[PDB]
Design an enzyme around this catalytic site. Structure first.
Site, PDB file in Angstrom:
ATOM      1  N   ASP A  40       0.636  -0.958  -0.094  1.00  0.00           N
ATOM      2  CA  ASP A  40      -0.341  -0.098  -0.582  1.00  0.00           C
ATOM      3  C   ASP A  40       0.750   1.347  -0.159  1.00  0.00           C
ATOM      4  O   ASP A  40       0.826   2.298  -0.656  1.00  0.00           O
ATOM      5  CB  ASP A  40      -0.617  -0.060   1.348  1.00  0.00           C
ATOM      6  CG  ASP A  40      -1.862  -0.663   1.151  1.00  0.00           C
ATOM      7  OD1 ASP A  40      -2.820  -1.142  -0.154  1.00  0.00           O
ATOM      8  OD2 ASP A  40      -3.261  -0.363   2.165  1.00  0.00           O
ATOM      9  N   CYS A  43      -3.321  -0.132 -13.253  1.00  0.00           N
ATOM     10  CA  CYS A  43      -2.386   0.532 -11.709  1.00  0.00           C
ATOM     11  C   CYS A  43      -3.875   1.130 -11.579  1.00  0.00           C
ATOM     12  O   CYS A  43      -4.910   0.910 -12.689  1.00  0.00           O
ATOM     13  CB  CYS A  43      -1.410   0.350 -11.784  1.00  0.00           C
ATOM     14  SG  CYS A  43      -0.395   2.222 -12.354  1.00  0.00           S
ATOM     15  N   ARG A  72       3.433   2.292 -11.682  1.00  0.00           N
ATOM     16  CA  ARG A  72       3.402   0.608 -11.158  1.00  0.00           C
ATOM     17  C   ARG A  72       4.194   0.139 -12.555  1.00  0.00           C
ATOM     18  O   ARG A  72       5.090  -0.398 -13.236  1.00  0.00           O
ATOM     19  CB  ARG A  72       2.624  -0.301 -10.526  1.00  0.00           C
ATOM     20  CG  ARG A  72       2.789   0.227  -9.050  1.00  0.00           C
ATOM     21  CD  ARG A  72       1.685  -0.789  -8.242  1.00  0.00           C
ATOM     22  NE  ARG A  72       1.244  -0.733  -6.959  1.00  0.00           N
ATOM     23  CZ  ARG A  72       0.495  -0.059  -5.631  1.00  0.00           C
ATOM     24  NH1 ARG A  72      -0.211  -0.864  -6.579  1.00  0.00           N
ATOM     25  NH2 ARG A  72       0.151   0.411  -4.954  1.00  0.00           N
ATOM     26  N   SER A  73       2.722   0.329 -13.551  1.00  0.00           N
ATOM     27  CA  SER A  73       2.565   0.437 -14.650  1.00  0.00           C
ATOM     28  C   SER A  73       3.725   0.544 -15.261  1.00  0.00           C
ATOM     29  O   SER A  73       4.332  -0.304 -16.417  1.00  0.00           O
ATOM     30  CB  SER A  73       1.317   0.528 -15.522  1.00  0.00           C
ATOM     31  OG  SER A  73       0.613   0.457 -15.413  1.00  0.00           O
ATOM     32  N   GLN A  89       6.370   7.056 -11.231  1.00  0.00           N
ATOM     33  CA  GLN A  89       5.856   8.530 -10.250  1.00  0.00           C
ATOM     34  C   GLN A  89       6.870   8.854  -9.086  1.00  0.00           C
ATOM     35  O   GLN A  89       6.383  10.329  -9.001  1.00  0.00           O
ATOM     36  CB  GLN A  89       4.405   7.701  -9.399  1.00  0.00           C
ATOM     37  CG  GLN A  89       3.801   8.063 -10.590  1.00  0.00           C
ATOM     38  CD  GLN A  89       2.405   7.362 -10.282  1.00  0.00           C
ATOM     39  OE1 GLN A  89       1.615   5.820  -9.922  1.00  0.00           O
ATOM     40  NE2 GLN A  89       1.717   8.331  -9.694  1.00  0.00           N
TER      41      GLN A  89
END
Ligand SMILES: O=C1NCN(c2ccccc2)C12CCNCC2
Length: 284
Positions: free
Chosen positions: A181, A215, A221-222, A262
């Protein structure tokens, strides 16, 4: 030079935030005018994440052809990916329309439906064999065929039917279920195992349409998934694997979708994944 030696200097110099900011400054800026039209506000999850006009995926319909999705075309590696947001309640039918129209074999999901106590994407696939889903707006039916639940990921077999022609296709759903998370995984071992399972399926191969990867926003994450895959493929192809520059590959990918990777921690994790993965690619 082994990408790892370089990895060590950045850690000791403590220069992750610095390099990350340099990437942000040099990244491409192209128009996203279709994404910002008022008719499309409820088709975007995040106001600050939009596909560029030049690389956006178009839906095959005259009404409204818009989806928050980009084609990433890597010319030297000979790989293509579609990166998209997690589907919204009113775009689940558009999502499956795109998979159908682009001839994709695989969907790669890197998030849970709920994270941090909030919804990160719609429940867009069926959870029981005998309860299929119908998308009336795009005329598609989706059935769960089988499910294989493992410690770090789940693979599902799905049947997508075009109700207009009664054609069917098998779609494979690759669900990475253990990204934390907060932050990034401590080891890249389970993420690399997962990438190798997607490759083994044929989902990334040129006989199919591009893989669909998502994602929540479809950039963090992608971005890590496509960056790691392309860098390892280039290390397999080049006379000198030491010539692969991860910063230069990431800036090439950012010509096709904004914001890929990110955080400085996602950038460090991408380096770790490529360094640990290369110890297979080079003959082990
Ligand atoms: O000075 C720099 N600018 C960026 N970066 C870098 C990134 C990718 C490939 C080669 C070099 C470093 C040099 C090495 N360690 C510090 C940071």
């Amino acid at each position: 030079m082994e990408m790892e030696k370089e990895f060590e200097q950045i850690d000791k110099s403590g220069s992750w935030a610095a390099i990350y900011q340099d990437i942000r400054h040099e990244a491409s800026d192209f128009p996203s005018r279709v994404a910002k039209l008022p008719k499309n506000k409820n088709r975007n999850r995040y106001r600050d994440v939009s596909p560029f006009d030049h690389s956006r995926i178009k839906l095959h319909q005259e009404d409204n052809d818009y989806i928050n999705a980009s084609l990433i075309k890597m010319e030297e590696a000979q790989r293509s990916y579609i990166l998209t947001q997690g589907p919204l309640p009113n775009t689940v039918g558009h999502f499956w329309e795109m998979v159908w129209e682009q001839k994709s074999r695989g969907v790669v999901m890197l998030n849970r439906v709920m994270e941090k106590g909030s919804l990160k994407c719609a429940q867009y696939w069926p959870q029981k064999e005998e309860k299929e889903m119908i998308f009336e707006d795009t005329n598609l039916k989706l059935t769960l065929i089988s499910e294989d639940i493992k410690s770090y990921y789940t693979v599902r077999q799905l049947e997508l039917e075009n109700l207009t022609t009664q054609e069917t296709r098998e779609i494979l759903h690759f669900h990475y279920t253990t990204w934390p998370d907060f932050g990034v995984p401590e080891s890249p071992a389970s993420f690399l195992n997962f990438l190798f399972k997607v490759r083994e399926s044929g989902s990334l191969s040129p006989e199919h349409g591009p893989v669909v990867v998502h994602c929540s926003a479809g950039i963090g994450r992608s971005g890590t998934f496509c960056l790691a895959d392309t860098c390892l493929l280039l290390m397999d192809k080049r006379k000198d694997p030491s010539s692969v520059d991860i910063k230069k590959v990431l800036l090439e990918m950012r010509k096709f979708r904004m914001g890929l990777i990110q955080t400085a921690d996602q950038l460090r994790f991408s380096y770790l994944a490529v360094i640990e993965g290369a110890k297979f690619i080079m003959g082990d």
